[PDB]
């Protein structure tokens, strides 16, 4: 009885977790797009549909 | 007889307790979560499912 009471007091209400933080860190997708000196900007190749007025 | 009566009077109805307060104080679980400058708040990493309207 004493040992079981001691075990219950020591364990308290501890709940086991099966997993920690997942080791797969990357969530985005790799950027495979080219980048040439003809690009209007580092993020846009052209401004094709743009109308000045 | 006198000694037994004195012992009974002195002890009264004292009941022995096998345990005191348990020395294990911590009841919560340790917070192992990271905290970066990208977090929207100290308690939330992001607001992913939130819709503005």
For A4-48, give the secondary structure using H, E and C: HHHHHHHHCCCCCCCCCCCCCCCCCCCCCCCCCCCCCCCCCCCCC
CA torsion angle B31 B34 B40 B41 (round to 10): 30
What is the experimental resolution, given in Å to one decimal place?
2.4
Q: How many CB atoms lie within 10 A of CB B32?
A: 7
* A42 contacts A36 by C-beta, under 8 angstroms: no
Which residue in B18, B20, B31 has the most chain A C-beta atoms within 10 A of its own C-beta, making it the best mutation to test that interface?
Answer: B18
CA torsion angle A12 A13 A19 A22 (round to 10): -90
* A20 contacts B31 by C-beta, under 8 angstroms: no
* A17 contacts B31 by C-beta, under 8 angstroms: no
Query: From chain A, which residues contact B within 8 Å (Cβ)?
Result: 2, 5-6, 9-10, 12-14, 20-21
- The token duo for B21 is 């307060």
DSSP, res A52:
-
Measured distance CA(B44)–CA(B41) in Å, rounded: 5
A12 contacts B24? CB cut-off 8 A: yes
**Experimental technique of record:** cryo-EM
């Amino acid at each position: 009885e004493a040992h079981i009471q001691m075990k219950a007091a020591a364990l308290k209400s501890a709940q086991s977790r099966l997993f920690g933080l997942d080791g797969g860190i990357s969530t985005q997708e790799e950027n495979t797009e080219r980048h040439t000196t003809e690009d209007v900007s580092p993020s846009m190749h052209t401004l094709l549909g743009v109308k000045n007025m």
